[PDB]
A = this chain, B = another copy of it.
Amino acid sequence: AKHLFTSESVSEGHPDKIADQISDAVLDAILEQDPKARVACETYVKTGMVLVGGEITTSAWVDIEEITRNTVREIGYVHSDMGFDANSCAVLSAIGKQSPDRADPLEQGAGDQGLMFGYATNETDVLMPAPITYAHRLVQRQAEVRKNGTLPWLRPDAKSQVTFQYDDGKIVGIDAVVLSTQHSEEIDQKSLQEAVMEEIIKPILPAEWLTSATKFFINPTGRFVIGGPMGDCGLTGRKIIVDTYGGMARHGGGAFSGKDPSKVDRSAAYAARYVAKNIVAAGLADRCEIQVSYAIGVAEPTSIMVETFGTEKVPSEQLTLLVREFFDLRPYGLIQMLDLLHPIYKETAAYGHFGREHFPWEKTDKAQLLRDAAGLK
């Protein structure tokens, strides 16, 4: 019935997200020269320094120092007084390089085991959960307005957290909203508070959802002048939830950034979002979670399961049927189905991996074809 759920998001320039973006920015850069490169690049960011370390198996030659500094500069950490300067921080690499030396490629077995969970739900335009959609849209507004000179006393680092009240299955409205933005010395908190309200919160959160009763908490501790990796620590794979579905859906361990698409931890997860978005887009269910798992060197998935949580329009038996017809969940099948061997990966690393319609895993192309085999309707 009535009950509430929460999801947080952070911006580009929160320290773990800096790490994600740099990892994915090396990955993109390597993919650009060598689309079949196998890469796993993990990054750690602390007040002075960025350490980017990984194994890469490629022919590409890339400049990790340069890639690091340019990513840190778009985010905007450009002066010691913000916390971190892209132009003078230390960059260290410990990247170990290797150079590359079944009859049907598609049958090649999964490298590493694991479980990936994908979800979709009709509660938004983008078939995503409303919480995490709004949480991202907030932090995203924050960067936009920061970067576009509107509220140029903002600094990079920022968190949002929306909490939504649902009477059963229907988003009723927004109980609380939290928003905290790093900002300059020369603005004080009450003046900040109407700017964040007017220019960030008011244009994103939908007004009939928003009420007398909505508890807003903009910079609740006040001040927050120095952020980013000053006094804190970013490392890749730490904002796993924000990255996916804000905790609306489950998650098996795994991080995405710095992982080239052969890594099932990333590409099975993308593929799984893709089957669930297609299932719901065709009205086979209202909301659908899928778990695929893999075992090392088997190529067919060791498990599939769907939970259309009471929301079917065709029984789950038949659904599990069609999941295997329309979708090649084999490790090399996913790459194929979704055309993954491209430098599309950096834009993924902030603002969430799913729910953005221009990613190959978000396209609803198998929609009707899936309805058909499920009994055209």
Contact = CB atoms under 8 A, between A and B. Distances in A.
Copies of this protein in the assembly total 2
Interface in A279-329: 291, 293, 295-298, 302-303, 305, 316
A136 to B, nearest CB: 14
B233 A302 contact: no
A251 interface: yes
Interface stretch (A70-78, A240-248, A349-357): A240-248
Contacts of A20: none
Contacts of A114: 8, 161
Contacts of A188: none
A202 to B, nearest CB: 19
Contacts of A53: 44, 46, 233
Contacts of A54: 233
A6 to B, nearest CB: 4
Interface string A1-24: 101111110000000000000000
A36 interface: no
Interface in A126-160: 159
A296 B241 contact: no
A221 interface: yes
Q: What are the nearest 6 A-B pairs in CB distance?
A: A6-B293, A241-B253, A220-B297, A178-B295, A247-B252, A4-B303
Interface of A: 1, 3-8, 40, 42, 44, 46-49, 51, 53-55, 94, 96, 113-115, 117, 159, 161, 163, 175-176, 178, 180, 215, 217, 220-221, 231-233, 235-242, 247-253, 255, 291, 293, 295-298, 302-303, 305, 316
